[PDB]
Design an enzyme around this catalytic site. Structure first.
Site, PDB file in Angstrom:
ATOM      1  N   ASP A 108       0.868  -1.211  -0.004  1.00 15.77           N
ATOM      2  CA  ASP A 108       0.024  -0.190   0.045  1.00 15.77           C
ATOM      3  C   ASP A 108       0.930   1.354  -0.132  1.00 15.77           C
ATOM      4  O   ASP A 108       0.607   2.047   0.726  1.00 15.77           O
ATOM      5  CB  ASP A 108      -0.833  -0.165   1.215  1.00 15.77           C
ATOM      6  CG  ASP A 108      -1.736  -1.275   1.368  1.00 15.77           C
ATOM      7  OD1 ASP A 108      -2.534  -1.306   0.280  1.00 15.77           O
ATOM      8  OD2 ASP A 108      -2.095  -1.685   2.318  1.00 15.77           O
ATOM      9  N   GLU A 129     -11.497   0.364  -3.386  1.00 14.03           N
ATOM     10  CA  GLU A 129     -10.786   1.251  -2.372  1.00 14.03           C
ATOM     11  C   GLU A 129      -9.298   1.975  -2.815  1.00 14.03           C
ATOM     12  O   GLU A 129      -9.073   2.208  -4.026  1.00 14.03           O
ATOM     13  CB  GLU A 129     -10.080  -0.071  -1.713  1.00 14.03           C
ATOM     14  CG  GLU A 129      -9.295  -1.262  -2.319  1.00 14.03           C
ATOM     15  CD  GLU A 129      -9.265  -2.495  -1.635  1.00 14.03           C
ATOM     16  OE1 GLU A 129      -9.870  -2.751  -0.588  1.00 14.03           O
ATOM     17  OE2 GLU A 129      -8.501  -3.218  -2.196  1.00 14.03           O
TER      18      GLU A 129
HETATM   19  O1  EDG Z   1      -3.438  -4.025   2.447  1.00 10.53           O
HETATM   20  C1  EDG Z   1      -4.489  -3.746   3.307  1.00 10.53           C
HETATM   21  C2  EDG Z   1      -5.635  -3.410   2.843  1.00 10.53           C
HETATM   22  N1  EDG Z   1      -5.986  -4.383   1.598  1.00 10.53           N
HETATM   23  C3  EDG Z   1      -7.014  -3.320   0.880  1.00 10.53           C
HETATM   24  C4  EDG Z   1      -6.835  -1.919   1.152  1.00 10.53           C
HETATM   25  O2  EDG Z   1      -6.762  -1.102   0.217  1.00 10.53           O
HETATM   26  C5  EDG Z   1      -5.781  -1.925   2.216  1.00 10.53           C
HETATM   27  O3  EDG Z   1      -5.933  -0.940   3.355  1.00 10.53           O
END
Ligand code: EDG
Length: 502
Positions: free
Chosen positions: A15, A170
């Site tokens: 991330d 997301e």
């Molecule tokens: O890698 C952890 C979580 N997986 C999907 C989301 O985007 C992240 O916060």
């Protein structure tokens, strides 16, 4: 000026989010159950990164009670505005969305500022002296305005986009370019379906229209099916010092049977972004291990020493503990060794043991450390653990037996299996070095004493993968000590920790 290798930050570094402060770049990753949290990197070229610290360094910033590889700290976002850095993230095991801030990335960051808007993957965008927050409550990307110093929400939450229809919309980020608000997100989930999509609108609050060419980055399609890289997504766009465009993203390197043990790592892609055009990532929305492309002028940075010593009396930012550590159990000796104080907490107790670790960053590597267990009762042990989760770890250790005898043991923990692969008697005198090697198929275990290396055998890599074990993390190599006797005051000294990747 030309060429780099991916990933740009290997091992457990998911991330990624990046900001530009003048000619400096700063990058953060998610850290889940580990302390300190949110590793912080610095680069001048986007290719080479130095870990300068961690954003969450004090217990008051980071409650990890009962955290594990599927909880704790999720995706973070870092932003730079008007001389202030902001790191915004979610503590899913604790109080949810919050940020911390500082004027100096290398300093101690602020206490948490807790935020009202829910969901995960909170991100910030600044314009006209206002601070806009996005996140994804109920699988809708929601927008609001906040005061980032107080955490006060200044406008109502509005739903803006929910992606193209792919799963788990997301990682939302807003950018403004050529009179358009661009909203970049991830869809498809962080496994083999991962993809980056993008939409735009003349207004920050919509309506957003998706790029007809979506997704802009994915290995999920025919074009990516043969790649050794998979799960490309969770991107963040950033401007080069020369006006070029780039994205950092997560992905992982697959292993036989569709396994990955090194976690999700940080990757870099060049982006074409002409005036009034949609962005195109590396021509065809894929990336490679060898990237034969122009770059910003390259400056190499400090990396992990092949032989780390503890003479300076401080662990580097790279070292991580499980949950919130018992700080008194990690000390530095007169003669510059790392001393770990025993507790009865094993590596399978779902609580913090006396355990401190470095992320595995290569498929092919050798790690080792000398281990001097002292003041030990029978069954007390100290050594190195190849650790994924409390139910998934391989332990190599020196154990105190009866009559002042010692042995080297090799124990595999996989759910209901606790398997002693080897128990070998040690010579009464001789300093023991414990050795863990790997390739993509196996971990190999051994020990060195009196100038002679002994093989203890091998175990499959796949049983420690995210696919097998679950969670959101990668393998770490931990120094640890556990007591298992009456009133033990045992401790163990480690003079160095060697790590070399091929
Ligand atoms: O890698 C952890 C979580 N997986 C999907 C989301 O985007 C992240 O916060």
């Amino acid at each position: 000026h030309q060429g780099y290798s991916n990933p740009v930050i290997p091992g457990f570094h998911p991330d990624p989010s990046v900001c530009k402060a003048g000619d400096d770049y700063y990058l953060v990753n998610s850290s889940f159950q580990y302390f300190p949290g949110v590793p912080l990197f610095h680069s001048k070229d986007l290719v080479h990164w130095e870990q300068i610290g961690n954003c969450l360094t004090r217990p008051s910033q980071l409650d990890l009670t009962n955290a594990n590889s599927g909880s704790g700290i999720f995706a973070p976002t870092i932003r730079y505005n008007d001389g202030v850095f902001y790191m915004i993230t979610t503590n899913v095991s604790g109080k949810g969305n919050f940020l911390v801030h500082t004027t100096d990335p290398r300093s101690e960051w602020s206490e948490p500022v807790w935020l009202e808007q829910g969901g995960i993957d909170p991100s910030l965008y600044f314009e006209d002296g206002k601070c806009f927050m996005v996140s994804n409550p109920d699988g809708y990307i929601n927008l609001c305005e906040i005061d980032p110093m107080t955490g006060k929400q200044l406008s109502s939450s509005k739903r803006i986009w929910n992606g193209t229809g792919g799963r788990y919309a997301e990682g939302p980020h807003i950018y403004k370019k050529d009179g358009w608000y661009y909203l970049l997100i991830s869809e498809g989930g962080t496994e083999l379906g991962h993809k980056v999509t993008i939409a735009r609108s003349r207004y920050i609050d919509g309506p957003y229209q998706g790029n007809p060419a979506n997704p802009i980055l994915t290995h999920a399609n025919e074009s990516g099916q043969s790649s050794p890289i998979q799960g490309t997504g969770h991107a963040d766009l950033v401007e080069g010092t020369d006006g070029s465009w780039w994205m950092v993203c997560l992905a992982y390197r697959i292993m036989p049977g569709t396994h990955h043990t090194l976690g999700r790592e940080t990757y870099l892609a060049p982006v074409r972004w002409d005036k009034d055009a949609w962005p195109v990532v590396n021509s065809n929305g894929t990336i490679s291990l060898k990237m034969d492309v122009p770059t910003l002028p390259q400056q190499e940075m400090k990396g992990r020493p092949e032989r780390i010593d503890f003479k300076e009396g401080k662990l580097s930012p790279e070292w991580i503990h499980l949950q919130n550590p018992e700080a008194k159990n990690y000390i530095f000796t007169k003669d510059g060794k790392l001393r770990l104080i025993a507790t009865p907490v094993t590596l399978s107790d779902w609580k913090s043991p006396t355990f401190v670790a470095l992320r595995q960053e290569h498929f092919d590597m050798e790690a080792s450390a000398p281990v001097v267990l002292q003041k030990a009762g029978v069954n007390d042990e100290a050594g190195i653990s190849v650790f994924m989760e409390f139910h998934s770890h391989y332990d190599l250790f020196v154990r105190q037996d009866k009559d002042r005898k010692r042995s080297v043991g090799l124990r595999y923990k996989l759910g209901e299996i606790t398997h002693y692969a080897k128990e070998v008697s040690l010579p009464t005198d001789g300093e023991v070095e414990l050795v863990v090697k790997s390739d993509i198929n196996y971990y190999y275990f051994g020990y060195k004493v009196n100038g002679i290396y002994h093989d203890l055998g091998k175990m499959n890599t796949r049983y420690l993968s995210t696919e097998t074990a679950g969670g959101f993390t990668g393998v770490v190599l931990g120094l640890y000590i556990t007591s298992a006797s009456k009133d033990s005051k045992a401790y163990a000294d480690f003079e160095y920790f060697k790590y070399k990747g091929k």
